[PDB]
CSV table of C-alpha atoms in Angstrom, one decimal:
chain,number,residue,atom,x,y,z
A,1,UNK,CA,4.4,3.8,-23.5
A,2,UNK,CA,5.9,0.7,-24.6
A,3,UNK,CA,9.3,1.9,-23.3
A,4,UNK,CA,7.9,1.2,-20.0
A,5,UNK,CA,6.4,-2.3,-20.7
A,6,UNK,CA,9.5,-4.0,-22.0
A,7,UNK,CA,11.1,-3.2,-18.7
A,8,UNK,CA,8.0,-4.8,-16.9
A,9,UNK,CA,9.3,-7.9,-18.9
A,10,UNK,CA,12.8,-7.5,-18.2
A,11,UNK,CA,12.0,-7.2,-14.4
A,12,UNK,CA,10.1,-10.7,-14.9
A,13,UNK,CA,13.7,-12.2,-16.1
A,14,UNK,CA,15.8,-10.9,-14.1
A,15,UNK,CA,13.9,-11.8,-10.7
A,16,UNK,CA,12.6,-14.7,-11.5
A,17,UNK,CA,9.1,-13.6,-10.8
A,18,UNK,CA,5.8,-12.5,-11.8
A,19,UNK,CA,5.8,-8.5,-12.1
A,20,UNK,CA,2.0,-7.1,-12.2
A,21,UNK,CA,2.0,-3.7,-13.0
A,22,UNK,CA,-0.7,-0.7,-13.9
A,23,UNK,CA,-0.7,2.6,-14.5
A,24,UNK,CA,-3.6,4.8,-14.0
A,25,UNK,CA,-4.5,8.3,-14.6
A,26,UNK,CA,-5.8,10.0,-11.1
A,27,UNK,CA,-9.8,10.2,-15.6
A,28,UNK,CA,-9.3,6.7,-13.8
A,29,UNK,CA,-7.9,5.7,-17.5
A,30,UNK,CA,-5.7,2.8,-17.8
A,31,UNK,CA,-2.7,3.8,-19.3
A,32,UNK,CA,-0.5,0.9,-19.3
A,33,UNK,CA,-0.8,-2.1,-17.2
A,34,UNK,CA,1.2,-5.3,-16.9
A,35,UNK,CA,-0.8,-9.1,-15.4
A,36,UNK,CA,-3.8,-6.7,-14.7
A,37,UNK,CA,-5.5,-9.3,-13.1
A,38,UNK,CA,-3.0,-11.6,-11.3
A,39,UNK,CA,-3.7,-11.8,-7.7
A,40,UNK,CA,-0.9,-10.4,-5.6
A,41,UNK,CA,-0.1,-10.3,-1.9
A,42,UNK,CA,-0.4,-6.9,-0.4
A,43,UNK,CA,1.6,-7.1,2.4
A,44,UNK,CA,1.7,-3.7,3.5
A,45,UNK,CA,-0.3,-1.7,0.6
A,46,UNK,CA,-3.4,-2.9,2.7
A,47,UNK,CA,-2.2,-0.6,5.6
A,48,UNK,CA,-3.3,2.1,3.0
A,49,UNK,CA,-7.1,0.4,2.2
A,50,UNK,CA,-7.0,0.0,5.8
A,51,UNK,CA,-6.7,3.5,7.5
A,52,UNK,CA,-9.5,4.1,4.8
A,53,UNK,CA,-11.7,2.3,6.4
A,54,UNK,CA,-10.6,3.7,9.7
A,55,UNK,CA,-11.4,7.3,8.1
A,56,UNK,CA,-14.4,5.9,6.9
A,57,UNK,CA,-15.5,5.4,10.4
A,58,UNK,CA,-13.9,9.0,11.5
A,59,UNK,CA,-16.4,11.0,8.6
A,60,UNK,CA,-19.8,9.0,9.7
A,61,UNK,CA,-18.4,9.5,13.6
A,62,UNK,CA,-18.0,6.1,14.4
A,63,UNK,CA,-14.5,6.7,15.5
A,64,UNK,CA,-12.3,9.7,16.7
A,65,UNK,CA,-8.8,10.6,15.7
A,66,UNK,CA,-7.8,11.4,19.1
A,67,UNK,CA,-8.7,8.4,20.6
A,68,UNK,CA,-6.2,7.1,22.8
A,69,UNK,CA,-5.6,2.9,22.0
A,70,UNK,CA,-3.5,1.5,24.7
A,71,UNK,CA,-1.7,-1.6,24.1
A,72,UNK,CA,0.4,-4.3,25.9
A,73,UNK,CA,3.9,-5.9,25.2
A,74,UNK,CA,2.4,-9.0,24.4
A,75,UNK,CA,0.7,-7.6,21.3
A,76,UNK,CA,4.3,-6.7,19.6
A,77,UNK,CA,5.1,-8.3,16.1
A,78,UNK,CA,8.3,-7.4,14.5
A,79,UNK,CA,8.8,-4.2,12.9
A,80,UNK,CA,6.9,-2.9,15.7
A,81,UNK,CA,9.0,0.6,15.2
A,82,UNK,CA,6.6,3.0,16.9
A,83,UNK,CA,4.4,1.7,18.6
A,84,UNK,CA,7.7,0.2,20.8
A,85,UNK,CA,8.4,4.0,21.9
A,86,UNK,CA,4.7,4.6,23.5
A,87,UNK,CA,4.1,0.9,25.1
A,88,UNK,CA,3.3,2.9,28.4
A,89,UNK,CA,1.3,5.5,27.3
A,90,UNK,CA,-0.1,4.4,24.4
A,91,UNK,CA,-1.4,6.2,21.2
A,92,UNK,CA,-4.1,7.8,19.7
A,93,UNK,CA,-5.8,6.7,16.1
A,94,UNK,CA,-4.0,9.2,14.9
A,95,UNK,CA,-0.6,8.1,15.7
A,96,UNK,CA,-1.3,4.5,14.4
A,97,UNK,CA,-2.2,5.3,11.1
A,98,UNK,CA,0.4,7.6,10.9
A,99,UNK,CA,2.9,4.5,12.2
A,100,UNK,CA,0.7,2.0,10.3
A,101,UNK,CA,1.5,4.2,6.7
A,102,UNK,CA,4.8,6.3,7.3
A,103,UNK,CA,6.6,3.4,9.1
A,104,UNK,CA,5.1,0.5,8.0
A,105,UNK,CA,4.5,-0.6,12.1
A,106,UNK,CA,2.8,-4.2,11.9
A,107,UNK,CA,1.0,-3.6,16.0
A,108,UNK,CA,0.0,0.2,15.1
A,109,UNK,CA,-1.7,-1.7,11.7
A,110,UNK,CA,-3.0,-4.4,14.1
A,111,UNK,CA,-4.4,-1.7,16.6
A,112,UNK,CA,-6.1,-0.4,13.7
A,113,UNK,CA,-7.4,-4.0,12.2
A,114,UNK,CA,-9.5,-4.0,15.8
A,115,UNK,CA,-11.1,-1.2,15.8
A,116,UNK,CA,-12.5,-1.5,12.5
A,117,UNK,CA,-13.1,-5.6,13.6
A,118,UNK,CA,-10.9,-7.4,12.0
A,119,UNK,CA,-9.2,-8.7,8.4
A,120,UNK,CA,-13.2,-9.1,7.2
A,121,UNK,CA,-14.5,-6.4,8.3
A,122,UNK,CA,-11.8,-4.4,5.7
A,123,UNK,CA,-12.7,-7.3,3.1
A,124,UNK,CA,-16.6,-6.4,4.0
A,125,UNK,CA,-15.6,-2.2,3.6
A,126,UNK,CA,-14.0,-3.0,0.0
A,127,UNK,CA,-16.7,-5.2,-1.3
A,128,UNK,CA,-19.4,-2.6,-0.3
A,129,UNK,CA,-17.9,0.5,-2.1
A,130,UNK,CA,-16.7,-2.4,-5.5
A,131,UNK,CA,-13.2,-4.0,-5.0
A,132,UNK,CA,-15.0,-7.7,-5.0
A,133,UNK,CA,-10.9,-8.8,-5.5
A,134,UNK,CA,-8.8,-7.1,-2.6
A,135,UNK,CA,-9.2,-9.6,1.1
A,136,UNK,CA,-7.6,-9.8,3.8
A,137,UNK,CA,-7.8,-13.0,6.2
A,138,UNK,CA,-5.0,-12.4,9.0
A,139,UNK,CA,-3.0,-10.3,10.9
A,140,UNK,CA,0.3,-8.9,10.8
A,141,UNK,CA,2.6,-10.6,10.3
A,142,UNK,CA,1.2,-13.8,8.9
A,143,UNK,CA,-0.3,-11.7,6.2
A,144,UNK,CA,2.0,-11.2,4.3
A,145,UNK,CA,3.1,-15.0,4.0
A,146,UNK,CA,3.2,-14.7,0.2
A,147,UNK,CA,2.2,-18.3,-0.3
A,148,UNK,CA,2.0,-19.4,-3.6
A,149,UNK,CA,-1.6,-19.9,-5.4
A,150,UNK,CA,-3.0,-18.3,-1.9
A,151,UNK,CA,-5.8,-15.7,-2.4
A,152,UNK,CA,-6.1,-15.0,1.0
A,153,UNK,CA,-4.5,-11.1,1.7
A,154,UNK,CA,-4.5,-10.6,-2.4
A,155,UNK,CA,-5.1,-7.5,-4.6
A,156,UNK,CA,-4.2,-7.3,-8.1
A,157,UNK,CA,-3.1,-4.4,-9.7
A,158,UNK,CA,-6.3,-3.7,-11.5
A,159,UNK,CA,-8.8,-3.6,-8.1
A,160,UNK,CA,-5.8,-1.6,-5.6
A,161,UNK,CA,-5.3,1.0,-8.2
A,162,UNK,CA,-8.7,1.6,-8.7
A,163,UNK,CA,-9.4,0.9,-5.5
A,164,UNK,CA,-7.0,4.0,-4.2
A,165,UNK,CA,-8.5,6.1,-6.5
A,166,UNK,CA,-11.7,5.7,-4.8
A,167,UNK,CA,-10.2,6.8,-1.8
A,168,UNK,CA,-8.1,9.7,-2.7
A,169,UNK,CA,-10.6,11.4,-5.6
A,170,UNK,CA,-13.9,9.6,-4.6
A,171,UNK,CA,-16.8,10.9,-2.7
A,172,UNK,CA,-16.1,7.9,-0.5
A,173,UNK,CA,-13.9,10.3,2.2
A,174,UNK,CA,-14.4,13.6,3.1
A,175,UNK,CA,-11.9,16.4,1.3
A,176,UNK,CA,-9.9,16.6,4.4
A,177,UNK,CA,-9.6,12.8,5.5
A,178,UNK,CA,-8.6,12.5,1.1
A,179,UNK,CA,-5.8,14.9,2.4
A,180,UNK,CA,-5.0,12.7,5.7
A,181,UNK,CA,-4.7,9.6,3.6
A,182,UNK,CA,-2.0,11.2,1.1
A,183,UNK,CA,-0.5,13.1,3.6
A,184,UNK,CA,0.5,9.9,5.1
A,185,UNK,CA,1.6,8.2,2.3
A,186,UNK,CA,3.2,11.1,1.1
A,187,UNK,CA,4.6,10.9,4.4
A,188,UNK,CA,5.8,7.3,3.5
A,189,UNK,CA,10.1,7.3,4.8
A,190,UNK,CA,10.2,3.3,4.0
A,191,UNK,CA,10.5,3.6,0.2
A,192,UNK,CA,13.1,5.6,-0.7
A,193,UNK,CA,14.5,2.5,-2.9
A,194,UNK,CA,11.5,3.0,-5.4
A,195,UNK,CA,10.2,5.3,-7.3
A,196,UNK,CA,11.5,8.1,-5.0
A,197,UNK,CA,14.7,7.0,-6.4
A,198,UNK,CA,13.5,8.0,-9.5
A,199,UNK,CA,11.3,10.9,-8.7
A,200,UNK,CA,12.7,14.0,-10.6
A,201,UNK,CA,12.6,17.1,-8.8
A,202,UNK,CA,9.6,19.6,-8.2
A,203,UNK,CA,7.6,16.0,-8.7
A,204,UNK,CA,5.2,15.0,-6.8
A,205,UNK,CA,4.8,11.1,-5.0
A,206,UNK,CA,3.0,9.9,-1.8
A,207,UNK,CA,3.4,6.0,-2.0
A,208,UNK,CA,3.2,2.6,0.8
A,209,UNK,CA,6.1,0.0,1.0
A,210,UNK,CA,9.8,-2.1,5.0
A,211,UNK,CA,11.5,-5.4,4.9
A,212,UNK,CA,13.2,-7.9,2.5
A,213,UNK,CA,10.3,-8.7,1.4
A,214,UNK,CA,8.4,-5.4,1.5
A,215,UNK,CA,9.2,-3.6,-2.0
A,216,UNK,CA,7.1,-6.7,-3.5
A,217,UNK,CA,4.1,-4.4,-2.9
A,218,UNK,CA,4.2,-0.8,-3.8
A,219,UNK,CA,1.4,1.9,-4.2
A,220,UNK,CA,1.9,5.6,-5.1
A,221,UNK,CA,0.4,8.3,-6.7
A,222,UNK,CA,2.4,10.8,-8.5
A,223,UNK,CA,2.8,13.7,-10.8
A,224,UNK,CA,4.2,16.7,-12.3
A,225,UNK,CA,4.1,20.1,-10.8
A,226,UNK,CA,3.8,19.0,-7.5
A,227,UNK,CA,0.5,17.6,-7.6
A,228,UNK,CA,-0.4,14.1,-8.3
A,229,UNK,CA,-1.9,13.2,-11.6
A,230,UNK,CA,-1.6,9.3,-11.9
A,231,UNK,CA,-1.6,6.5,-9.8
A,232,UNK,CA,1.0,3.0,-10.3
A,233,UNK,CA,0.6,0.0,-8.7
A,234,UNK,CA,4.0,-2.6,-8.9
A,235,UNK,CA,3.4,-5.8,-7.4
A,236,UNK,CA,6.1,-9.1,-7.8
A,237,UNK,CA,6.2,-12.4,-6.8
A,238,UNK,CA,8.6,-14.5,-4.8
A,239,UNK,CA,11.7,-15.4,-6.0
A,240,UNK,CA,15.3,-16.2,-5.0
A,241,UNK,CA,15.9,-12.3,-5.3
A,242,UNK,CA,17.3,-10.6,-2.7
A,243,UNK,CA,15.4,-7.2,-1.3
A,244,UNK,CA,18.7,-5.3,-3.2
A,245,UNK,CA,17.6,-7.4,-6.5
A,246,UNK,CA,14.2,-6.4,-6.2
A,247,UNK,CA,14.2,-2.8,-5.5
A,248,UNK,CA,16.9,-1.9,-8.6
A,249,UNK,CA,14.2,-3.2,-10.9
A,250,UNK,CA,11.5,-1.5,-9.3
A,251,UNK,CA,13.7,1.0,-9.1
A,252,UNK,CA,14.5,1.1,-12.5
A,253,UNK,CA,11.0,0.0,-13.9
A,254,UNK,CA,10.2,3.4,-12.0
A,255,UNK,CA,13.4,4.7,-13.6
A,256,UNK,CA,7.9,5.2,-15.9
A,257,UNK,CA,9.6,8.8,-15.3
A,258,UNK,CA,11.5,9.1,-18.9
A,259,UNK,CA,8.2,8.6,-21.0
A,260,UNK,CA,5.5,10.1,-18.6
């Protein structure tokens, strides 16, 4: 709806920043979109992409779910919030992607990164099943440096939200590692000040945002009826906003709801 675009264009004023934005129907239609194909820093929204390659390996039985990853206290980065509680006993896959996705922990995501072999090795995954745009290059929490004119760790809109419905609809994972994936996100605690915000009840939403800097990039897939019928992508740039800033516009850009 045009509605929704002028307050993509508001959010560009009042941040100072570059908002990309799509909207896409879980048909894979575009229904409205926004800088479709501005590269944007993921940040976090690659934790997402990432446990799908992880899952990728868990269908083919290249890795386990149970499998019990135990780590050191050298390998903490900050916003470590799980993954500090089991320093002596570890965790399993299981548990990471579950920190990696509900609690946005930058180790658990790093455990992961590993396993799978690295930053290329998810690049390498998303070329192979057609998102030639989404890379990642580093580790947490370097990635998510936001450098301006960087493409290294960079969607846009258009490849992410195409990208995640691959994942969650596709053939690409099996019908109950689909259900893992959105049962994490919808699992997702550390975006409350989003679209949740907005959410209506009896709605559905299962998203990925955790920091000052970490409502920049937001997934989610939503719908009425409890069951999800779209997908939205909101990416923005930096800007002298403040997190609080940030958030209200997302907030109310998501505020999307009023002419669904």
């Amino acid at each position: 709806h045009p509605e929704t675009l002028v307050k993509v264009k508001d959010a560009e004023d009042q941040l100072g920043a570059r908002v990309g934005y799509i909207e896409l129907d879980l048909s894979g239609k575009i229904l409205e979109s926004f800088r479709p194909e501005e590269r944007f820093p993921m940040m976090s929204t690659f934790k997402v992409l990432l446990c799908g390659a992880v899952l990728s390996r868990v269908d083919a039985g290249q890795e386990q779910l149970g499998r019990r990853i135990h780590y050191s206290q050298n390998d903490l980065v900050e916003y470590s919030p799980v993954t500090e509680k089991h320093l002596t006993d570890g965790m399993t896959v299981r548990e990471l992607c579950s920190a990696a996705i509900t609690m946005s922990d930058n180790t658990a995501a790093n455990l992961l990164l590993t396993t799978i072999g690295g930053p290329k090795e998810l690049t390498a995954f998303l070329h192979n099943m057609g998102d030639h745009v989404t890379r990642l290059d580093r580790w947490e929490p370097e990635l998510n440096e936001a450098i301006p004119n960087d493409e290294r760790d960079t969607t846009n809109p258009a490849a992410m939200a195409t990208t995640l419905r691959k994942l969650l609809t596709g053939e690409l994972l099996t019908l109950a590692s689909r259900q893992q994936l959105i049962d994490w996100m919808e699992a997702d605690k550390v975006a409350g000040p989003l679209l949740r915000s907005a959410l209506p009840a009896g709605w559905f939403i299962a998203d990925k945002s955790a920091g000052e800097r970490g409502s920049r990039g937001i997934i989610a897939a939503l719908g009425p009826d409890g069951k999800p019928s779209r997908i939205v992508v909101i990416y923005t740039t930096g800007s002298q906003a403040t997190m609080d800033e940030r958030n209200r516009q997302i907030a109310e850009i998501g505020a999307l709801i009023k002419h669904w």
